[PDB]
Design a protein around this ligand. Structure first.
Ligand SMILES: [Ca+2]
Ligand SMILES: [Ca+2]
Ligand SMILES: [Ca+2]
Lengths: 67, 105, 156
């Protein structure tokens, strides 16, 4: 029984657990659209992280060799 | 020099000419890699029973709160990399004719 | 950035080299050594709608003085002409990764040879030699990021 845990799970109840079946139709759609868009942001953020490890490593080679 | 500087320059231009193509080829590979990673991580929606249709919409709502946290954790890693990249780059940086031809001839 | 001008000098049409030789022979009208000293470069500059200083005048002579005789001869004059007739660093960095295939951070000889064969043009033993010792300006068999920038100066 956590205060911040009980309140967190209530976000579903306040947003979903109360209304229409025809609105739940066009509401579960936009809930997946948000995941897909965030899953796309997460892919691009992972790819940029790969390129930075190369960018940083090349810098570590330059800073050393130029001393 | 063993070869003419005109050939030396022609070869240098063709090296970047394909290195650009390998980059655009790399972008097309990354575009296809994303769509495949999105059909796996974001299996598209398809239908239900009005009662047990809801516990999936509840499951989607809980997914958004976790996906955005995973997106934040990787974002903050990219953010800290930007700080170090600019910091590392800071450290290393420390270490007429045609108007004449007409007015002459 | 130097051997990019000699290429433009080499590819000058003999009808362009004629106009330059003609304009060069008016340039040097009245010079003892038959070459552009500071008097000759002085007149044609102040009369070209300018007025450089005697010191500032020499740095245009010495910018293409591969002779040291304080006088721009005709061959140096062609280099001077093509100097007044590239690639951004941020863009050359993105291509530096395409060469570095093993992703170590340098461009060894093997990675250079693979790119050269991928150009479709016929590569020779002397093309590979001169190119590597042109980019590798300290003879370590590799081209780090700083040299690769100097290596691709002004390349289209
Ligand atoms: Ca000279
Ligand atoms: Ca390498
Ligand atoms: Ca080197």
């Amino acid at each position: 029984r956590e205060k911040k845990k009980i309140l967190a799970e209530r976000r579903k109840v306040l947003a979903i657990d109360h209304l229409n079946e025809d609105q739940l139709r066009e509401k579960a759609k936009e809930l997946w659209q948000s995941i897909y868009n965030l899953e796309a942001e997460k892919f691009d953020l992972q790819e940029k992280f790969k390129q930075q490890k190369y960018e940083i490593n090349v810098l570590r080679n330059r800073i050393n060799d130029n001393q | 020099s063993k070869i003419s500087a005109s050939r030396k320059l022609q070869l240098k231009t063709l090296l970047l000419q394909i290195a650009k193509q390998e980059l655009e080829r790399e972008a097309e590979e990354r575009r296809g890699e994303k769509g495949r990673a999105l059909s796996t991580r974001a299996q598209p929606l398809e239908l239900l029973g009005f009662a047990e249709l809801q516990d999936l919409a509840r499951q989607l709502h809980a997914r958004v709160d976790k996906v955005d946290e995973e997106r934040y954790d990787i974002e903050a890693k990219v953010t800290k990399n930007i700080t170090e990249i600019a910091d590392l780059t800071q450290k290393i940086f420390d270490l007429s004719a045609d108007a004449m031809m007409q007015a002459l001839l | 950035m130097d051997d990019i001008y000699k290429a433009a000098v080499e590819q000058l049409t003999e009808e362009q080299k004629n106009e330059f030789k003609a304009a060069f022979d008016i340039f040097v009208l009245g010079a003892e050594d038959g070459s552009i000293s500071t008097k000759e470069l002085g007149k044609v500059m102040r009369m070209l709608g300018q007025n450089p200083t005697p010191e500032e005048l020499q740095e245009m002579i010495d910018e293409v003085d591969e002779d040291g005789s304080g006088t721009v001869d005709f061959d140096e004059f062609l280099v001077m002409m093509v100097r007044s007739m590239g690639k951004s660093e941020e863009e050359l960095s993105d291509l530096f990764r395409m060469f570095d295939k093993n992703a170590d951070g340098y461009i060894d000889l093997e990675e250079l040879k693979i790119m050269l064969q991928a150009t479709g043009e016929t590569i020779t033993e002397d093309d590979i030699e001169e190119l590597m010792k042109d980019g590798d300006k300290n003879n370590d068999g590799r081209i780090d990021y700083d040299e690769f920038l100097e290596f691709m100066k002004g390349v289209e």
